[PDB]
UniProtKB/Swiss-Prot annotation, chains A, B:
Source superkingdom: Archaea
Cell compartment(s), UniProt: Cytoplasm
Protein name: Methionine--tRNA ligase
Family the entry assigns: Belongs to the class-I aminoacyl-tRNA synthetase family. MetG type 1 subfamily.
Quaternary structure (record): Homodimer.
Native organism taxonomy: Archaea, Methanobacteriati, Methanobacteriota, Thermococci, Thermococcales
tRNA-binding domain location: 7-106
Amino acid sequence: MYVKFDDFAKLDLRVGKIIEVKDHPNADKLYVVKVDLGDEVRTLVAGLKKYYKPEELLNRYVVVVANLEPKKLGIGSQGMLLAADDGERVALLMPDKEVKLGAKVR
Amino acid sequence: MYVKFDDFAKLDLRVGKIIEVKDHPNADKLYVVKVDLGDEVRTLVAGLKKYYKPEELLNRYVVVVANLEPKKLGIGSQGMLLAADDGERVALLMPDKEVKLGAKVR
């Protein structure tokens, strides 16, 4: 279903860096990662335990929907990391080069 | 400004592969690329002439807002490739691993 440009612009996609990956004590397959957006530190709950080992996620440049309305998952989460998934594999999005943390995706 | 989850779900972010990069005769800095979404072939107008040489964009796995309402830019365009930009550099988003073309980003 076609989406209008403003419907896209409403989203604030930013580039961030995962600073901490901790296990979410209150959910089996969720990780509680902290993302560094340069001016702020978004801590969000992401389900990547099944596809990523903490060692892999740390220091990774990821893409997050920064302005997603805060939620309580267990623990407080704000935003989500984007990753593609072809029903089989799950692969996080990332810039092809490094950029100022908090870089606007458009 | 907080965005509701459905406001995010409205968008169809897909992984695609750039099959062709041609110069847009009717605009200085625009490229007219064709993206392979696996089941379809989205041809969209992207302004990357300034940051990417055709040789670099070809065979690249990129992320596109598939369901963006078709537009006439000059030439017909549907959707747009996502790239981060810290006001200086411009870096396309891409999966960290390869995935079925047309893979849903979420």
